[PDB]
Amino acid sequence: NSGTTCSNDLLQPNTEVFTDVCVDYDLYGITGQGIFKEVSAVYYNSWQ
Amino acid sequence: SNAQALNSLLQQLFNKFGAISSSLQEILSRLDPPEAQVQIDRLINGRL
C-alpha cells in the first residue's frame, strides 16, 4: 500500500463511445454532457 | 447591439465570481455538502 506502480482494472475501465444520444462524458477532466457525431476531419497533431 | 448584449449575457455563465470554479458539476463532485454551499451562493449572487 505504498508506491506509484499501481494496478488497473479496479474501478475505472475504458468504455466505448455512443452516438446520436447525449450522454455524460469525462474527457481528461471535463465532466460535461452532450451528443457525439462521426464527422471525419484531419486537423489534429500528435499532442493535440 | 442585440447580438452583443446577448453574447455579453451568455459570457456571464463562465465566470467564477470569487468561487473555485464556474461549473456546479465540479463543485458538487469534489466538495462536501456542508461546505460546498458557499461557492454556489456567490455564483447565484453574481448571476442575479
Side-chain angles (χ1 to χ4, degrees), chain A residues 1-3 5-7 9 11-48, chain B:
Chain A
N1 301 331
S2 61
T5 156
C6 296
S7 181
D9 208 340
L11 49 86
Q12 48 278 83
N14 52 93
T15 60
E16 68 148 346
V17 55
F18 300 92
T19 177
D20 297 70
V21 280
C22 60
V23 299
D24 196 324
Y25 54 88
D26 188 8
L27 306 173
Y28 317 136
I30 282 176
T31 68
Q33 300 178 0
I35 331 180
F36 296 90
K37 291 186 177 300
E38 223 288 314
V39 46
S40 299
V42 43
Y43 48 85
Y44 291 89
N45 293 121
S46 59
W47 66 94
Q48 298 174 346
Chain B
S1 180
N2 181 85
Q4 291 180 0
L6 296 189
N7 295 330
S8 60
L9 182 60
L10 179 65
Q11 289 294 148
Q12 296 286 350
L13 233 59
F14 299 93
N15 295 267
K16 301 181 182 300
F17 291 150
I20 61 178
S21 180
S22 60
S23 179
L24 295 176
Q25 180 67 22
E26 297 290 340
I27 301 180
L28 297 180
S29 180
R30 300 185 298 101
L31 278 61
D32 55 81
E35 195 268 348
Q37 298 181 0
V38 186
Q39 327 294 340
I40 306 181
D41 201 334
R42 301 188 182 96
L43 290 179
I44 290 179
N45 285 272
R47 295 177 181 180
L48 289 176

